[PDB]
């Protein structure tokens, strides 16, 4: 919703057991809403004391490992589980299938505020790094890099460049820092135009079918494969309204009785993983919240991408 | 059980049964006449359709190789 | 139209249920037939159904897939269609909607008593309107018909207070100006059932299996097929999927999650090309991603020009991906040893070694640290361009026409970008 | 009236990393940064029937027919190399601050009462006994589990990482410190002071825990076995599967946490076992029996509602158990 | 009424390792730590028809048609080099102790009764006969299964590894010590006392056992062999796959365990065969017939349910068999 005055690079963060089930329809890399919520929790915890705002997160995902296995005779996969403790009668409890993933991601954070002029860049960078080293990113603990060879501090780069060439060199150096990974971006325009292409191909086609067609490998008879522009993952694109926004004390057993609750349904969109050298600026990769609370639509996206 | 005859193909099991994992298993053998092509260990709970579908990939590969091996010549 | 045919159909339904439970019980004595026909043969069974419709609930989004010791409010609501483009949901389910049933595993019979097609339509939409054939086909008295209609139509409306349990998920969302909403999500079991049905047609359908056989026979077919690789199975009910919901009893567990995976989700290893002559043609080129990219360039090089420039745009994007992977290869070459390029060897591609190992400038103070700074090696991509010249088709029709000119233009532009990327490696 | 909060959830304080397992030689433990990792391999087993028979298949003909059919499995096995008698197990522990602060709470009054109860607990005795027991369970390598059973010598090195360097190095003989006695030692008290300051603090305390076990040359190490459901599939699967991160055998973090939380020596049953893991309703998976039942007044939930709501503060041991549950975490709250 | 527990899981005492086989020469076996490992190479076999016919192909035309077109296979084969006659097999055994205590037990009172039963056994007759027979099965190289059947001379060296150093060395001629007679020898009694001290919990016993067998120059050795589910054609008709850990042939640990457990000379059938491996229902896969069937009251489960549940103590050799089963370990217990 705003252009960041600076970009803070949180380095390689090893998230231990992240929620591999991103959505009721998708598994794998966690939701971008988890990353945006983590950055908002960082702004809630240490952002206010530094007189800065932390909005917008760019994910690089340097490493992914899924705690999964492939059973013999099946081409699908299953989630490795954890043994929950027994009940009070000594019996095994009912198992809820929860999957885990070891992530290694680096985050670009959009920083704007007067506190950037009040503190050194390395000071606020080290403060938000030591705050983020005791938090969670998708349900997993963050490994804060103890007793390895060379630890990685941040590099907060001011986006108000004095010259266009110096700004370009800063963005290319920051892209070179986060090199072995893929920027995950939102593709609402690509999914909508592919929906229009399928509607010209066949009418009454929903956005779900256009999302599904952009993920399966289509085999065409003369036997070739229908190509895709990018990786084109199905991402959770936010939450849509399923109920009116009830009063803060209205909903029974809410998390807090001061925040209003509204039952939601998952919104599914198309995301794309790209090499981060294929972007004009690294501020395009930032994932922003977008509530629009009168109509539900509690989305996260990448505005100012293309 | 009994052999599955798919054209010239015969899927015949070994009379001995093993217990791979905990479940009982049988070593099913796929022959094209006297030549075997795939020996695979399959459960005794498998139906005949599942035993057919296990060897269907090798069957289709041999069919493709026979089509591309004895194709007639082309005059242009 | 007539109430008499609806009465005949519901009497036939309860008679079929009576003879089914008589065949299931197989009773020949102990007066079980009289007790069976004393409660499931007359209108009082409908009154007994009045004791069963209040327990069941027809829902589209439920909480019971989240931890089964949680008791929340499962609600049947169709979400509004979003005005923003390019995103899907359960709002896309229009007439292709299957409503899940939650409650006891014994009252569910009355669900088909609300899902028959007597006059040609579903009886819940028949009971949502005050029709002339309605309220007479099931009850002789008016007030009994009204209370039976209210109880039978209450299976759609949510019961109890609006509530989400502690074991359910609740996630704060930042408002634009100074606020939060708590936003408890529910499992879209109707949407999950629709996606699972579509995947069932895609993977085990008759037309899909026929297209798979046509691919296996390498013959033509009027329609294609799909594969859906890397699917994940998430069983909700451990040993009792019927306890979760009725739709989860239709598909026993098996959430069938789509692979939203990053491209580095299957990182094999990092290897150092010691005794080899060129990195692009021996080790980097054998990775499967650039393999599929090179086969894609081979397929797109020998093609018609009718969509040419648009295809060329795709081709430009395609060729960009390959040099991206080259940088990605160099990226995982940042994960190797600092001084692997200084090891002994007769041939180890020393022309590329200034870019292969950037960390040897830390190893050698002046033996090779100043060499990469003074040389500024950016011609290596030109060598990679030579390898990329092995990615083009050997067709004279492309060379005669301007297709080779456009290929050389986009190749020169992308290796200009690659050489500019390799130039400022010293910063 | 001080009703209990309907949602009440606590973060996992003392959250460990996955215990990376590598191999080497004893007296080379100082240069253990380049030790090769233990790799999980596959092997085949042909056993015979040795389970109990239920008096319908005990006839000699059917039993001989069952033996005549060969029972085969594939098992994931982790072994030491045949020139490395020492197993090194390394993980990172983050002692998080705000141990008594819940993640979620409905009632503001219940949150204030719980914070006041925890604050009185820190003002009275602190986390000093609990961090002593946590430092004990770090000091003996209980997180090695079956790797600790037949080892010749186990030694635990624990390094406090303040910013990027080892602020304080502790070295413990893990076999000398028992699995059931919680005694007093000066280095153990210093580690207890550090862990209690991390629990009482606002940030986090970072520790690197490495355990070297002299199991034997080429012996079988025991990483965490992965819980994979067969789900009634037709094709037979591998019976035993192990856990690894990247060609490197590992133990799950919850197993290391369960070994770290094995401090509960105050359950009403007899302590023939010794300490058990801090669980609500005192569940022990190795026994199939749950101590600290709610029919007695010593389960975690009734102790919390007595300590917080009705102001019935229990004994100091049960207060230690309650705060150990709060450090452990969990999802609580009636409907 | 003292019902037996649903779970009575026992750990494995006498833990073996994967016995790696290297190659070398006789009279150079003293310096054998540098010996190159036996490689599992590949070769091709042409299999003629040599099995029983099913009274349908017994016609000469179809038999000659099958013989005219035979079937080829690729086998993993492990051989000595042409200049190496001696096979060396190396593994480490770990005698743990605490054999009476089970790892998991649903019933505490049944666990106490079993502990009292094993304690009264040890007070009456400790691990003296059992450790003597285990030292016998180590002394003769029964873990050389088909590497012993035609060996010219077998020599077994057992070194007690204490603090990484050899505490005591034993050197046995494995051909003089038979595979069926359990006689007495002073060095064998010392090894029996060491395994007794290991099994009683009075000490930590790790042994390095190296067996040198004279098979011949280039002769085929017999390591452990893996199960092959699919032969196919992408894998070039792989009919036999032998076990190897890292370019080095090896025997499975459980094969060494089964060879070490061959102490049971007290089954109700005649001992003309000799000892059999200790197992519930005394099963031999090569014989295909269970000695100690559940019908004749001499198997492990009925003897354990008489000795512990109903205090019906069996004979001294039969309670030796029961305690040997407890040393072996298992998933004893009903469902």
Swiss-Prot record, chain C:
One of its GO terms (biological process) is defense response to virus. Disruption phenotype: Mutants lose phage DMS3 infection-dependent inhibition of biofilm formation while there is normal biofilm formation in the absence of phage infection. Decreased production of crRNA in the presence or absence of phage. Disruption of the entire Y.pestis-subtype CRISPR region disrupts crRNA production but does not alter phage resistance (possibly OLNs PA14_33350 to PA14_33310, and the flanking CRISPR loci), indicating this CRISPR is not involved in phage resistance. Pfam families: Cas_Csy1. Keywords: Antiviral defense. The keyword Lyase does not apply. Residues 69-90 are annotated as: Disordered. Interacts directly with Csy2; part of the Csy ribonucleoprotein complex with a probable stoichiometry of Csy1(1),Csy2(1),Csy3(6),Cas6/Csy4(1)-crRNA(1). A Csy3(6),Cas6/Csy4(1)-crRNA(1) subcomplex is also formed. CRISPR (clustered regularly interspaced short palindromic repeat) is an adaptive immune system that provides protection against mobile genetic elements (viruses, transposable elements and conjugative plasmids). CRISPR clusters contain sequences complementary to antecedent mobile elements and target invading nucleic acids. CRISPR clusters are transcribed and processed into CRISPR RNA (crRNA). Cas3 and Cascade participate in CRISPR interference, the third stage of CRISPR immunity (Potential). Involved in crRNA production or stability. Belongs to the CRISPR-associated Csy1 family. In this bacteria, Y.pestis-subtype CRISPRs do not confer resistance to phage DMS3 or MP22, but instead are required for DMS3 infection-dependent inhibition of biofilm formation and possibly motility. This is CRISPR-associated protein Csy1.
